Amino acid sequence: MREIVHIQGGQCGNQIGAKFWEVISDEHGIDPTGTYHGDSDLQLERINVYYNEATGGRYVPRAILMDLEPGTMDSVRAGPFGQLFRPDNFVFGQTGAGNNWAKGHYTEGAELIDSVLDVVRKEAEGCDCLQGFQITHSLGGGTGSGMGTLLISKVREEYPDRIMETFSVVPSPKVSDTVVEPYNATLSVHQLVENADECMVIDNEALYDICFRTLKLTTPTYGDLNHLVSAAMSGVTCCLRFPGQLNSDLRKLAVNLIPFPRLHFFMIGFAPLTSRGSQQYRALTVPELTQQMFDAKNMMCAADPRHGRYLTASALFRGRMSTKEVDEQMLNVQNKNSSYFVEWIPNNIKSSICDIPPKGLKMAVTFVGNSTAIQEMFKRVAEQFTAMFRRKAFLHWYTGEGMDEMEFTEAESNMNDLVSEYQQYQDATA
Amino acid sequence: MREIVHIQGGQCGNQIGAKFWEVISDEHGIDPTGTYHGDSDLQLERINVYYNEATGGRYVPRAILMDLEPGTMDSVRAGPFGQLFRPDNFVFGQTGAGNNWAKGHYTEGAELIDSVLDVVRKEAEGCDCLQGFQITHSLGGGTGSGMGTLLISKVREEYPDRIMETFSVVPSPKVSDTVVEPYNATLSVHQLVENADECMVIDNEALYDICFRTLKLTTPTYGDLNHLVSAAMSGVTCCLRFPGQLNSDLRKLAVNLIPFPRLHFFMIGFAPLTSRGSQQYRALTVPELTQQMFDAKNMMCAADPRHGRYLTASALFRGRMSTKEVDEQMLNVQNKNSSYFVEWIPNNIKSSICDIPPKGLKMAVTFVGNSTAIQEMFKRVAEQFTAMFRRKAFLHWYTGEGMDEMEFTEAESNMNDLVSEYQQYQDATA
Amino acid sequence: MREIVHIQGGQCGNQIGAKFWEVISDEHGIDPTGTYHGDSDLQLERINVYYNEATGGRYVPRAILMDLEPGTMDSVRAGPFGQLFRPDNFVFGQTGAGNNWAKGHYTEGAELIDSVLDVVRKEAEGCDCLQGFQITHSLGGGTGSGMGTLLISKVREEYPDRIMETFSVVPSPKVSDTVVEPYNATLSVHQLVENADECMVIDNEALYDICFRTLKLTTPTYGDLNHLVSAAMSGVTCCLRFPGQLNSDLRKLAVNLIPFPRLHFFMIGFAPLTSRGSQQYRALTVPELTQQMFDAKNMMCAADPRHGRYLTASALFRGRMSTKEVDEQMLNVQNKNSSYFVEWIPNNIKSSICDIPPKGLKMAVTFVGNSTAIQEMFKRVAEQFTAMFRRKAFLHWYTGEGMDEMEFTEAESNMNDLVSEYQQYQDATA
Amino acid sequence: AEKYKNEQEPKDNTSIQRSWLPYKDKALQVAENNLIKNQTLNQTKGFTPFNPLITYKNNMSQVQQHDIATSLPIGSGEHSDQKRTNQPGEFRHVRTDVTLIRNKPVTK
Amino acid sequence: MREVISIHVGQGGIQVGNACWELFCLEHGIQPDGQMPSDRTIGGGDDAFNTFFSETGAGKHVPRAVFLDLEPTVIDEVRTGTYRQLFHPEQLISGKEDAANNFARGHYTIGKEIVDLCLDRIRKLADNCTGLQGFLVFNSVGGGTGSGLGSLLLERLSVDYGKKSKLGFTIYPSPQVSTAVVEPYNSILSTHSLLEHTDVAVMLDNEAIYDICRRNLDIERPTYTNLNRLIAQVISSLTASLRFDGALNVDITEFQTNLVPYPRIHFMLSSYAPIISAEKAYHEQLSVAEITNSAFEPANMMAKCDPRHGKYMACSMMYRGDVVPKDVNASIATIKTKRTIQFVDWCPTGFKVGINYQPPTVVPGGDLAKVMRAVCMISNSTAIAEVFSRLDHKFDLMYAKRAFVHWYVGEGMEEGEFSEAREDLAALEKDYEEVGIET
Amino acid sequence: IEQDYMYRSQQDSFKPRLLPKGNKASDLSYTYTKQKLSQIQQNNNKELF
Ligand SMILES: Nc1nc2c(ncn2[C@@H]2O[C@H](COP(=O)(O)OP(=O)(O)OP(=O)(O)O)[C@@H](O)[C@H]2O)c(=O)[nH]1
Ligand SMILES: Nc1nc2c(ncn2[C@@H]2O[C@H](COP(=O)(O)OP(=O)(O)O)[C@@H](O)[C@H]2O)c(=O)[nH]1
Ligand SMILES: Nc1nc2c(ncn2[C@@H]2O[C@H](COP(=O)(O)OP(=O)(O)O)[C@@H](O)[C@H]2O)c(=O)[nH]1
Ligand SMILES: Nc1nc2c(ncn2[C@@H]2O[C@H](COP(=O)(O)OP(=O)(O)O)[C@@H](O)[C@H]2O)c(=O)[nH]1
Ligand SMILES: [Mg+2]
């Protein structure tokens, strides 16, 4: 019944997926031991989208766990909800990636991808009717970036018509934790546009910014940042698992958000968000949810969406509500901000309603937008890349695995052309 | 429905606003926790004028608090009824103004005013039908007189048609707390005439004088003056919140009180004020109320009403009475004091009636008057200003922050023209 | 047709001229080698106003560069865009003037003015119908001011009907470069008042103020100052080269601005001028465009316009804007600030509109206003000069070169006469 | 804006001085009730902090510990619910059963 | 599963090995005899100590290290001290005659009968380890047997193993305060030896640590034990990420991947913070921003060098304790804002941040105060050319008059070796100069 | 300068050609849909042996 498998790699990918399965399990009322303890039957009707079936009535997720070192999967197994993961699904190497794109994409990635791909093939064919793939990985790391994009190339070759979703984390110059990030970031972005149907950029600079400003919590931790990402992940596929006034799956959103096949980079946000000391003073209504949704500071990306023009946008609503206000509120925001929407695509906003809100809430909104302001991320990354590349700094590591400068050269041109393409469509009038 | 938003700045403004919100909460029967505990249904029909609604049925005032130093807002938060105000509406700096107009209007005021302007815009767009603004600030202070008037200019530019009020505490020579009062007082008086639609001028000296004669209490305190001003403020807008025979909103006051565009400086008063000893020995009737109303010592300004002539006046009765008696008393007083009213305008007194007296009172009257006696209040301020500015005393603090003495020269000139054009009608005859 | 030729004098003139010709060439699309690189047909409709046709289709400017030292020509020729000029127009002395107005006017000028008059007559007769001459120089130096004032003096008697405008960089005492600035400045004004049809005063002090405050750039250089002058200089003849709603050539401005023949000194300013880190928001509409125009800070002269009354004003708008709002704003500023305008010219502001905006900008405007505020700059120079003339120092070198104290006395008296007859109109009433 | 002083002498009792109002002001009774409530709350916990005013600041806030369905239930933060001893060898690795292999398989 | 092997050659190497190994035993709770005394120890996967120690089959744990020296005094002192029962009897290789401050003796004449035993023991240690990360080398450059055996052993290991990482914590002579007289000769010769055969080299000059101890710990008469303890703390901070849980962890292949731009340039200097005594430990907040700010001060460098005279190329920073990523990010933002510290143009970002949860441990009888935060620095900078320049200046003064060279030539070494060493050191100095220029 | 004119004019005379036809993952999915839609007929008309 159009289920989707989960794939995650690297340290950043593993931690995001470690909390995503925690939120979903709470959403469907699955205890850490694997037993259903819900209240309503709607929680159990469409459980097959994520969970398989085992003896004794326990449910097991169809998640695949990959990394080139055993250190990370020791932590995910010891954490909460860690007994819900298949011991056979774990596939690990004993060497690591060393923050090197070449090492994780040519030498160890090639010699390990055979084992993980067999798990993917067995997991995918077991289901009656597949729906697509979703991947969580980081573009600043070694094994998340290198072998992670190698699997994407292999999967797209064997499963052509399926939908490929990627919750990607690119590095920002402000909060930097690696000197060699521009190399393995640009090389992955060139590969990402090759095959991925949908790309959803995430920045730690933006996620930190929300915690200091919006939630007003003094000491944020990676566990707090993972919760915001996991909340948005379940939102985009909310209506695929529950009834609603209007239905929308992953394929439907791709149709209404991709004017051209190469323009498949989205920026996402979630509402509502309020600090603990300010929750009692806020009234939750459809006007309030949509007011926070378009706010620039609410995005999970470092790009400012008011520096460019939206091409397409989408909004998914959770909980019971009236279709009259939902229709008119999207109408009002389009009329008041006609300068921020390009003029050759009238009615460039999508609405969807699911009647089951997230656990512990009454109304929730997930936003996915295609904007031409995302290009300033690739501009600043390529700005740092060319500064290092003109002096051939750190290049002896990459050349040591057979990769030549031609791959570096063609990564520059393809990245520049993608940036040049976004600007041209923003600079277009009827 | 024709609701108003409240803006307060500076220490004096914050104290007046806190006391006023206490009085309004008492009138509407709202406990410090924001839960309605009234007895009559009339207390909820128009609650939206001053209060919003949130989750759990608690009501939040739509008030905005701004300052440059966190000293006073930390006190109002910890004081009683301090939990009503929304924590997001507290905007403050960290440096303070130090009784310098430039520090609160050019450098520190400008950098901080963006956030408070955004909050004001959000609150104004949230409400259904905006009716106007009311401001409480002090003209003799640093952050108040400067930042409040900068915000006044900004909001008047942004909303051109909405009516606007100010309750300004202008310094007086008899009770002096600062040596640099004339400078920023003159500057703010210059900046107010072009933007403020209605000004309610107040002195601390007049309030002390009232407390020492009429109230006859040995040891008054700043709380008493605060509560008198709050009672007057609440009495201004009684008919817009409660039913009556002659409903009169804020625009009806301006039309009946402003003959010429630049004549909008009023002096207010309240009745009845009774000593503690003679509380039960005094009868409450319309003639007594109007006699105390037009007693010259009941005004909240140091200017003597008997040194000039009234242009127009307005009285706002509250409680149950007879329309004939009120009109007869107004006619009688206007006929017996014919020399005190300018002759070329007939019947220059307006009366309005509301059906709800204050809490624990039978009848109450709020009096607002436009009289030429305001010339003396500005005359004495300008007298100090020139005698101090001729020697250029304390002027390097102002000129050390981008301001030129040409601004002082122009500000002094505009005040003199205002006084002359205001007093020309005291001598002009038809 | 109705062509004007450019002649620049002194070190200051060549620096200003070097940037001005780079500015104009960019507007009309001429490369460093003199070949067209524009995109529209209108770039050649009136290209003959400043250029000549050369064999092969190349365009060359009508600039005559004169000086007493070759150190300026060999520096401006070797710079970029220096190949456009014809070498035959390069005329320079071999000895230098040494900041000596007498040397630049009596002993060394007399033998070299034979060459400049030959070339300037050739250029003047080459055009079909001459319109006027424009000159850039400074009154603080010797060669720029000395042979300068002499040059206008004689070319005037050959062309008593053609208009003559000059841009004057008058020195300021707060930021002074030469000890003998009062001497050569007073003499230059005497020879310039009775010869030039139009004169514009430029203060280098104000140029620092604009760059420091509005531009908010840390380190300005002489190049940036030259760019500020050229931008205002170019906009004066904007409608002379491009069509517009109300085109107004130089003669039109000359008639409308000077009420009397001896009052032809102007102050100029430019708008809009934004900071380097200008965020992408809104657009520069007329209400904010005209607000920055009349700001006293935006003026490029040390004379504060609020110290006197405006005799008249003129605005040169660039862009596609409606005439109605342009007209009514000028009525708005006149009514609001009637104190700064002389009452005996009703509607004393002239407006012009040009359809071609400056490159890379939506709407721009240039201000040329004649106000009684310039008497301060004359008064302050006279005080310095009379202090430096009683001492009889630095005079024997002026005296020991063909002249005596009679010229200085008549120059001071005439300059005093100018100020006296300039203040009478300020205090005159109708 | 005033020093709340209550004593037997009427000239400095505030309530005796501010009785000229047409009604009973809702600031003095609220303050007294707050003082009594803070005293009782301190007795429940036990603070005796040398004066009742020290704990009065944070005994009046209505901030609930948990969320009220207007934001994501992430709590007050991971760092809030963390305890720290400092014995040597406290944070050593555990090597759970998933990665603890023994026999090193030889064939493929 | 992951292991490292420590190699100690020379008296300085052994006297640093003593301190680092006592610190490791105290960190992992191993008593001096060799057995864990807790008696609550269990099996399963609690084998966090396998990085340094190894099960002995019955009881104790044997460290993965060897000691080399041609002079038996220090090794006999180790065999007599309280750590007698810990080390394996056979893995303490000792000679008969000292090298006597001569590079030729320890590299051509008497090192050949010890190098074979050393390789045999290293192989017998390496076959035991299954996840061998790499090697650590401790030696004193300004000493005969130290430099000679270090050179020969590095050359042999480069061909015996190859791709395994090699890290060297060597001790160059101080610019003006030194003990020996002929240390420039063997210093430059060992510089050539380690230029093309090591992966990462760390500067460990002595008067720098002397000044650090005098300024911070208020000790007017420091000795070698304090220096060894500080170096042991540095080593533990560097290696902590292998065996303790942390938010952001690094490895040996993590360090050199993000720290050396070119194969030739791998010389770098270290720093530590905070260094404080018990008396001053009370009255300081010891915030992360404060300790990171103190870490970049020129007076805290472990080598007598001033980074203000050159540009940086990379910075690897390791935190341990209870630090947080947002605070460390703010600290790096402030450091980047500061103008006194400047980087090279072709390195826009230059910070690698590792965070470890384990707070530093304290040795009873030590000097460092017991703290809950610490930061270690491994910075590669262009300003390191000064130390090579000063050694070159000293060498020429004696080589012009050919002092002491008869002893070097009577042991079989040809005269041209000095010329080759000088040429190659000059070539190295030029490379460091051309790297730091702008494009 | 005249050959500069000619070269620049002829190189400028070529500008407006966009034809958006980016197809890397879309084309791979496209050629699969066409194959399965067309090769079923070729499968079902095959002659038995
Ligand atoms: N920092 C530090 N340096 C030491 C220590 N012990 C010896 N050294 C250094 O070693 C140098 C002298 O060489 P030694 O270590 O005594 O002997 P060697 O290096 O083994 O060479 P031989 O003299 O032939 O035995 C001195 O200059 C010291 O710098 C120590 O405990 N700490
Ligand atoms: N948002 C988020 N970012 C993370 C998390 N864990 C690590 N990162 C980021 O990932 C980067 C390091 O990635 P890395 O672990 O080297 O990727 P890998 O080598 O492919 O496993 C760091 O800069 C972190 O900012 C997480 O749980 N959430
Ligand atoms: N009625 C009343 N007036 C006050 C109060 N507090 C201060 N003032 C007056 O405000 C003046 C000082 O203004 P200030 O608060 O310093 O202005 P600011 O610095 O801009 O906030 C004094 O002259 C007081 O008379 C108060 O609680 N009630
Ligand atoms: N705006 C501007 N002013 C200049 C420039 N060069 C010199 N000046 C001013 O001109 C004055 C000196 O003029 P000077 O060079 O002696 O003129 P000259 O005698 O013709 O060479 C100084 O006070 C400077 O402020 C320039 O490039 N731009
Ligand atoms: Mg020895």
The answer to whether B300 and B206 have CB atoms below 8 angstroms apart is yes
Nearest CB among D67, D74, D80 relative to A227 is that of D74
Q: Radius of gyration (Cα) for chain D, nearest Å?
A: 29
Residues of F in contact with C57 (CB under 8 A): 1-2, 5
Instruction: Tell me which residue has tokens 């036990």.
Output: D46
- CB interface of A with C, residues 302-331, below 8 Å: 306-307
> Ligand 2: which residue has its CA nearest to atom 14?
A141
Contacts of A329 in chain B (CB under 8 A): none
Nearest CA to ligand 3 atom 15: B11
* Helix or strand holding residue A206 (H, E): helix A204-210
SS3 E283: coil
D8: closest CA of chain A, how far (Å)? 40
Q: Is B128 on the interface with A (CB under 8 A)?
A: no
Are A279 and D68 inside 8 Å of each other by CB? Answer: yes
Q: Kindly give, in sequence order, each residue whose CB lies less than 8 Å from that of residue D39, ignoring residues fewer than 6 positions away.
A: D52
Tell me, yes or no, if A219 comes closer than 8 A to chain B by beta carbon.
Answer: no
> Is the Cβ pair D17, B55 closer than 8 Å?
no
CB atoms within 10 A of CB A64: 24
Kind and range of the H or E element at B386? helix B374-389
**E12 CA from centroid of ligand 1 (Å):** 4
The 3-state DSSP class for residue A6 equals: strand
* Ligand 5 ion: nearby residues, β-carbon < 5 Å: E 11, 71
Q: How many helices (H) and strands (E) does chain E have?
A: 15, 10
Kindly tell me whether chain D and chain C come into contact, counting contact as 3+ Cβ pairs under 8 Å: no
With an 8 Å Cβ cutoff, are A273 and D72 in contact? yes
Closest residue in chain A to residue B56, using alpha carbons only:
A280
Q: Do A282 and B54 touch (CB under 8 A)?
A: yes
**Alpha-carbon distance E49 to nearest alpha carbon in chain D (angstroms):** 9
Distances in Å between the Cα of E3 and the Cα atoms of A241, C230, E48, E243 are 48, 72, 11, 10
Q: Give CA B175 to chain center in angstroms.
A: 19
Residue E21: how many CA atoms within 13 Å on its side-chain side? 29
Residues of chain B with CATH 3.40.50.1440: 3-256
Radius of gyration of chain A (CA): 21
Give the three-state DSSP class for D96. Answer: coil
Q: Ligand 2 centroid vs A138 CA: distance in angstroms? A: 6
- Cβ contact (<8 Å) for B219 and D11? yes
Is there a contact between E349 and A208 if contact means CB atoms under 8 Å apart?
no
Residue C142 in contact with ligand 4 by CB distance below 6 A:
yes
Resolution (Å) of this entry: 3.7
Beta-bridged to residue A369, according to DSSP, are A267, A313
Cβ proximity of A186 and A415 under 8 Å: yes
| Kind plus residue range of the DSSP H or E element containing B28 | helix B10-28
The finding on whether A64 has its CB within 6 A of some atom of ligand 2 is no
Query: How far apart are alpha carbons C417 and C421 in whole angstroms?
Result: 6
Neighboring chain C residues of A306 at a CB cutoff of 8 Å: 280-281
Q: Are C139 and C183 spatial neighbours (Cβ–Cβ below 8 Å)?
A: no
Judge if the beta carbon of residue C226 lies within 6 A of ligand 4: yes
**C-beta pairs of A26-35 under 8 Å, 24+ apart in sequence:** A26/A359, A27/A234, A27/A358, A27/A359, A30/A59, A30/A84, A32/A80, A32/A81, A32/A82, A32/A83, A32/A84, A33/A58, A33/A83, A34/A58, A34/A59, A34/A60, A34/A83, A34/A84
Helix ranges (DSSP H) in B86-148: 101-102, 108-126, 143
Of the candidates D67, D77, D98, the beta carbon closest to that of A77 is on D98
- The answer to whether A388 touches E346, Cβ cutoff 8 Å, is yes
Rounded-to-integer distance, Cα D104 and Cα D106, Å? 6
Q: Which residues of chain A form CATH 3.30.1330.20?
A: 265-374
> Is the CB of D71 inside 8 Å of chain B's CB atoms?
no
C93 CA to middle of ligand 4, Å?
A: 18
Nearest to B298 by CA among B394, B228, B234, B375: B228
**Treating both helix axes as pointing N-terminal to C-terminal, what angle do C405-427 and C375-390 enclose, rounded to 10 degrees?**
150
Residue C137 alpha carbon to ligand 4 centre in Å: 9
* Contact C40/F at CB under 8 A: no
- Retrieve residue A241's tokens: 């698992």
**Phi/psi-derived region of residue C34, left when phi > 0, alpha when psi is between -120 and 50, beta in every other case:** left
How was it solved?
cryo-EM
Ligand 3 centre to CA of B11 (Å) is 5
Which element (helix H / strand E) includes E316? strand E312-321
Pocket test of ligand 1: the residue of E77, E108, E139, E140 to mutate, having most ligand atoms within 8 Å of its CB, is E140
Both structure tokens of A392: 């051939």
In this structure, are strands C163-169 and E200-203 parallel, antiparallel, or unpaired? unpaired
Q: Is C280 exposed, middle or buried (0-12, 13-18, 19+ CB in 10 A)?
A: exposed
Task: Report, as residue numbers or ranges, the catalytic residues of E.
Answer: 254
Give residue E241's Cα distance to chain centre.
17
Do the annotations mark residue C416 as ligand-binding? Answer: no
Give the chain D residue whose CA is nearest to the CA of B274.
D20
CATH match of A265-374 with 3.40.190.10: no
Closest chain E residue to the Cα of D96, Cα to Cα = E45
The strand pairing partners of D10, in sequence order, are none
DSSP, residue by residue, E319-369: EEES--HHHHHHHHHHHHH-SSS-B-TT-S--EEEEEESPPPP--TT-SSP
Inform me whether the C-beta atom of residue D68 falls under 8 Å from chain B C-beta atoms. Answer: yes
Evaluate: CB of A13 within 6 angstroms of ligand 2.
no
Nearest-CA residue for atom 16 of ligand 4? C141
Q: Exposure of B284 by Cβ count < 10 A (0-12 exposed, 13-18 middle, 19+ buried)?
A: middle
Fold assignment, A3-256: Rossmann fold (3.40.50)
Would the CB atoms of F22 and A161 count as touching at under 8 Å? no
Which residues make beta-bridge pairs with E65? E6
Chain B positions in Cβ-Cβ contact with residue D57 (cut-off 8 Å): 78
User: Which residue carries 């509560």 as its tokens?
Assistant: B227
Between the two ends of chain D, the Cα-to-Cα distance in Å is 83
Between CA B348 and CA B335 the distance in angstroms is: 11
**In whole angstroms, what is the distance from residue D39 CA to residue D46 CA?**
10
Interface of A with E (CB under 8 A): 70-71, 75, 94, 96, 98-100, 173-182, 208, 219-222, 383-384, 387-388, 390-391, 393-394, 396-397
Which of A107, A108, A101 has its CA nearest to residue A69? A108
Site to substitute for ligand 1 among E21, E141, E171, E211, most atoms within 8 A of C-beta:
E171
Which amino acid type is present at position B96? G
Q: Whose CA is nearest to atom 19 of ligand 1?
A: E143
Is A144 marked as a binding-site residue?
A: yes
Nearest protein Cα to ligand 4, atom 19: C141
Residue with tokens 């540095």: E234
- Strand pairing category for B3-9 and B63-67: parallel
Q: Does A219 touch chain D (CB under 8 A)?
A: yes
- State the angle between helix axes of E144-160 and E11-28 in degrees (0 to 180), rounded to the nearest 10: 70
* Residue A167 φ/ψ, nearest 5 degrees: -90, 90
B94 C-beta neighbours (distance < 10 Å), count: 9
Residue E142 Cα distances to A90, A295, A406, E12, E186, angstroms: 51, 65, 46, 10, 6
